Structures are given as C-alpha cells and as structure tokens.
Design a protein around this nucleic acid. Structure first.
Ligand SMILES: [Mg+2]
Ligand SMILES: [Mg+2]
Ligand SMILES: [Mg+2]
Lengths: 113, 71, 52
RNA sequence: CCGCCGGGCAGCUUCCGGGAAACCAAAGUCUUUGGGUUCCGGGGGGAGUAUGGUUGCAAAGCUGAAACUUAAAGGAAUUGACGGAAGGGCACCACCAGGAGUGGAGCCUGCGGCUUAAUUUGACUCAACACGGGAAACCUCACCCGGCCCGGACACGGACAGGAUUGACAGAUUGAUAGCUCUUUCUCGAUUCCGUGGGUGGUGGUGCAUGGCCGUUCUUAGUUGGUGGAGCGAUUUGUCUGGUUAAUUCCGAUAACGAACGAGACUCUGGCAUGCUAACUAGUUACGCGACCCCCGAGCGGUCGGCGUCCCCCAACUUCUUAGAGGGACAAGUGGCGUUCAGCCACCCGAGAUUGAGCAAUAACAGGUCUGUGAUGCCCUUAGAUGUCCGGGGCUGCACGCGCGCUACACUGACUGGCUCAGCGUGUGCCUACCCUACGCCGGCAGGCGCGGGUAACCCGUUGAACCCCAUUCGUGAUGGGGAUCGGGGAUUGCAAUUAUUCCCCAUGAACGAGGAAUUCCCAGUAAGUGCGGGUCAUAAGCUUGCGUUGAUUAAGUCCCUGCCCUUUGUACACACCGCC
C-alpha cells in the first residue's frame, strides 16, 4: 500500500493540485480490517462548493486475498485559473485589488488637450 | 437445521431401457419391409410410424420427440 | 440506508427540466441554420412545422 | 523610623546545582564515587504471622523465622474517561408554562412469546418495534408437504453403426397433455450418454473474513497543523480568566505570530419587488368591448350588474400565472444598555440583525448491511442438488406480552338540505404488455355498458375538498356517537381470492362516556384537525413523504430532571464506572 499510494499522492500534487487525499480501507496483512488515510495540501469538506471542485472517485480492488477500497478525492486548483475557473472563488475567498496608483496631492495646476 | 430422514422409498432414477430396438423388421425372402401393429396420426411421423403392447403404453417417436398420444 | 437500519433518513433526489420555446416565421434555410448552430451541451431541440 | 551584626521561627525567586519525578538553599558539593559517625532497606505476600526469648497485672510491648505462593506489586509524573467536585456555557431526542397527545377501548399492522410440520427471516437500550422501502394469493420466497425440472459451464476422459438415444402424437399413471419414469417404437442425427477433475450457482453460511453504502457518538462545537516560545523527552502553548456568540465566533487580555479543516460563507428553498424581459404549452387583463345573447338579471326605455360564451384576432398587456435576468435586507439608522471593543437590547423605515433543509471535520463504533449490489474473503452445498421452479402451503396462524398508527368516546357536537375556496404532484401509449382519463346511455352501487383529449402549463383540469362554510334533524340516550364482530347477496382485479383479495349492496350490530403505573413535541404560519397527492399498486392501502387548507394555547427562560460542550480539579478508572474493588 504504502509505497504505491504515495506514488499516486506524490504525483497528483506534483501534477498541479490544491490538495488531495487517498483512503485505502480494507483488510491489510491481517485478519482484521484497517483503514489507512494519507493526505496532503488543502481540502474543503462541506458546502455546495465541494460539488464542482473536488473530484471524488471510489474504486474497489479485488485481490488474491479479498477486497480493499480506494477513495481518491482530489481538490482542483482551477480556483486560481480554470481559464475562467467556475466561480473561481471558494466563496470565503475575496481578492481585493490594491491601490495601484493614488499618487500626488500637490498644488492644483491644470492642463489642455 | 434438520438432517433429512427421507421416508424409505428412494425413488428410482431410470434408464429409458437399453434396447437394440431395430432387429424386428420382416425381410421376407428378398429386400422388402413392412410389418403391422397399431399406428399414430402425425405428419412427420408419415404412415410408417409404429405402435405396441406394455403395461398399457404404445408411443410414436417421429416429429423428432414432439408428439406421444394418451393409450 | 441500504438494508434496514438506523434512524430513518432519506435523500431528496431532484432533477429539474425547464422548457423555453420560441415562435418564428422563416424558410427551410433560417430553420436549418439556427437549429444546427447553438447546439452542444445536454440540450434537446424540437422543431414543429406549423400551428399543430 | 532607618540601618548593621549574631544566632531563631518562617517566606518568596532562579536554567547554582541537584533531582525518576513531583520537588529541594537546600534533597546543592555523587562515576568529578570516599569530612565524621549512628540507624536501617534489598521484588510482593505469607507476616510483623508461627515459634522461641523477655517485659507487662493485660491490651499488649519488645526481639522475630520458614514452606508456600507469587509476576509483577509500587513510585513519580501523560493523555484519557468518570466523580454522588467545582466554576462557566448549552439542547424542548431536557424541563419549566400547554396543548396536543401517547400509555386505557376497539380496531390496524410492528415486533415478543406460545402454538404450529410452517408460522422463513434480518433488526435487541437507546441511534431494534408500518424498519429491510417488509401493504406479501400465485411470483415474490429464501422457508414446509410435496412434487416436478435440469440450466452438470469447461476441459479431461468414455461413446464409428446391427444408429451414441438428440428429441416422442392415444393410456398406467401423475397434480401435469412432467417420455419424469414401466413395452412400442417411429426421428435430430455426431448431438448424445457414463467416469474424472472441475465448476455454477445458491434470498446457503459467516457483517468479529471484507469493499461500498448506510446508522450513530453528532447540525454537538469541535479538529489540525508552520513557525516561534515551554519542556532531555511523551508532550505542551498557540487551542484563553472575562465579555461576547446559534456557533476556539470574536476582541482582548496575550511566549505568541500569522495559517488550515469544521462552524460560518455556499446551494437549494421560502417569503418585498403596478421596477425589466417576455410569453396562444399561462394567464390572460382589462378592454375595444365589435358581439350571441337570453330578462341570466337591474331597469318604462335609455343605461347598467353579471356569469356564460362568439369568438377569433392582424387588441393589448403583463394587473395576478409562469420563469429568466434583477434588486433588496445588509444589526442597515436613532435611543438605550455594554470593558462603552466584540456586541446585546428597544424603536424608525420595513421582510429587522434569525423563513426551512442540504451540504456537514478530525476521529471513532465487531452499530446495520453478505438478503441493494455481476462488490465479495474464505467456508459450506453442489444433481436426490440449498442450482431454477410448479402446486399447494406458510410467511396472516393464537391461552398471553410489548411497538409504532387510525377511530372513538360526542352536541364548540351527531346525522338531514345545501355553497364553495389548491398544490405538490401524477398520469397513455413505459426493456416485453401494459395508463391517465374528459363526455354519452344503462344500473341503486360497486359498477356497467357508450363513446372523446392526452411526450402533456394544451387532455384529465376555473384539478369545482374536507374540515371548513353555510341550510334543516337530535336532544345528552353507550343514543343517530361509535361503530367492531358475524348472516346474506352483488360488482371488480386477477388463469385463480378457499386463507372475509379489493369494492359495493343489503343484514347483525360490539368495547369505549377521556383512560391505571409511566412518558415525546414543540415557539409562528408552529401544535392540532383536514383532505388531497406522491411513493408503495394487476389488484389495491390504517404505511410513510409532500402539499396546502383551517389554523390555536403557551415558554421566549433556565439548568430543577435527562443528556451535550468547554475550563479548573480529583481519580487505585484507560474493555474508561454498564469501571476498578
Ligand atoms: Mg537522599
Ligand atoms: Mg557514594
Ligand atoms: Mg522481600
């Protein structure tokens, strides 16, 4: 499990993800069932937002023993730049564009054009 | 659960009889074939179709196995 | 719940289906232009001939 | 009063240095080992016992063994977690103040039990009990009393022909026109059959072998990390005295600073929008009213009030309908209160900061689910098959027990006229045979028989409802409430209703006159009643989930019970008090 799912989790982040997680539930070198969860980066876990942002995916896996569950759940950073990332803001997140110019009090003066 | 006693009457799985069947074919001197007994009325079983004596049964077997009467 | 049990919680599975419709008067060009363009997503388009 | 000095009782503080740790000017000077000396411990119990000696008037005192058994007992600090600890805070699955009930009766069906061949079965406090969508004739269905059927893949073996037995119309039978079998035989004809291994299923087994999905601890406020700072280090602070807040939500005090998930923001929804874009699949609106138009009605007549239509439309428009873009509502203003911050309270304009769900973290739990899954581990079983079914039967059975419902107990009501107000849906023509229904006759009625529209905003359908509202009986009689249990008919669905299928029509005509011990539900369009859709459906619901409709009383606070959050604290608990002993 270990070396593999890191190999995945490593990849999906390196690819260009806001964050991600993987869960490998099921029996795992023991008559008892464990549940393993290796996580990285950011992840929202509630709201409508979840619906168009996370990329959930369950897949089983049938092995020479029995059955594990994969759950990959990636967070998309199309929030930065979809191209027009859908909504883009996670509604929490506001981006205040900064003063930019606002130079000069000065004495009055005029001009003509 | 229970363990099945079974009323001691272990029902017969049965053989459909062995039978060579085709020896009884009256070749009178030279080559010519026709005996007489009882007959069936079917089409694929065309006239040659042939019958019997049992503890009752009699049957006709020639719309492949489609069509045995009730006698 | 698949199977029986737990305090009885249900989901409320919804699908909407809004219908717009637009009347017009044209030949067999303007219909076959305007219908074939502006297609693409999960959108169904009907074309009535006339009146009924 | 202010100093100093000796030796006393003590305090705080600190990276001396100690110290397992708590702590300790001393427990400091100790692997950098010894200033002097006294006592005294060597795992725990047995045991401070037995025995011996001695002192004592005696309780007893002092001295003081072993066999045996025993793996830890113990100490210091850590998180837990529970206190019949303490402060704070919070939930109507809590209470108060109530109403509604519920718990009583009958009935319904949920389970328990008994009974029964069978009443398959999962589910066991809560978070099992009209729950498995679990309203079952047949199917379902697995289960029993049978009984058929093979659908034995596959390969590996065995079977060229005096045709391997593929497949058999009248009777013995059998339930069956099951060649499933006891003679006869007439065809397909390379299938067949018999071994072996091996499957193939199985609503078989095991949810403590698992996936997913669900339930819940728990719509409770919680959880986490980067850097700092503290601890040798598990760990700890940040993550908090107090005010606040639905909410570690905020501000601030602040060895922390600035971040992340949960909450919040979001989505759907629900309500202000004579503001916009429009709409023969809305409405239409009101016209213009051009009419028909009958006195429908007013009025002598002009004129008018009004349903219906005659519409259509090349009116006109969105006043309501619809659904698109919009706006808005944002503690926004003012006055209190408040550390005069964070906010809270009142009032103004007005929807006053809260209309109601979904989504819901970390982390759990032998919760449930193998019978939702062609998800399935292993196990069983595997032809006489637990493979799939036909016929029947059961799942419905009944001295008792509980669980969710409905209907009553009546006159603010019962039955007798009448008037008259929707909303969310839903509908045919659908994956294998099947609807929604308008309007004619017939019949009382169930219904029947005629015929009509309907991929529907058109047809059902101004969805023409009940309460409700209005019109007469009745007279507080277990009565006309109630309305069970049976007698008898008649329809309908269904191939078939026996095991009253469902409905109607008759006929009988019960307990209950407000429910003993308990206990859930909740604050606004809320409880309650009230139908109505949907789901379940051939047949069909006393089931749920929605929907209006009629619409109350009362709390608007507290922790008094129950249970939840934090903080401090105690803890011999860490299978966590349902503990340990
Ligand atoms: Mg010492
Ligand atoms: Mg020494
Ligand atoms: Mg000792």
């Amino acid at each position: 499990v270990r070396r593999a799912c890191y190999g995945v989790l490593r990849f999906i982040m390196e690819s260009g993800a806001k964050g991600c997680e993987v869960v490998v539930s099921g029996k795992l070198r023991g008559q008892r069932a464990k549940s393993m969860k290796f996580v990285d980066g950011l992840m929202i876990h509630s709201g409508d937002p979840v619906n168009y942002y996370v990329d959930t995916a369950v897949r089983h896996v049938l092995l020479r023993q029995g059955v594990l569950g994969i759950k990959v759940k990636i967070m998309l950073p199309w929030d930065p730049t979809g191209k027009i990332g859908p909504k883009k803001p996670l509604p929490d997140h506001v981006s205040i564009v900064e003063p930019k110019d606002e130079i000069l009090p000065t004495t009055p003066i005029s001009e003509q054009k | 659960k229970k363990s099945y006693t079974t009323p001691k009457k272990n029902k017969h799985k049965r053989k459909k009889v062995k039978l060579a069947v085709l020896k009884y074919y009256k070749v009178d001197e030279n080559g010519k074939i026709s005996r007489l007994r009882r007959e069936c009325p079917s089409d694929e079983c065309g006239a040659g179709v042939f019958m019997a004596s049992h503890f009752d049964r009699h049957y006709c077997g020639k719309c492949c196995l489609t069509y045995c009467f009730n006698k | 719940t698949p199977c029986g049990e737990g305090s009885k919680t249900w989901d409320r599975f919804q699908m909407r289906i809004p219908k717009r419709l637009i009347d017009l008067h044209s030949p067999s060009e303007i219909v076959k232009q305007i219908t074939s363009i502006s297609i693409e997503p999960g959108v169904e388009v009907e074309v009535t001939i006339a009146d009924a």
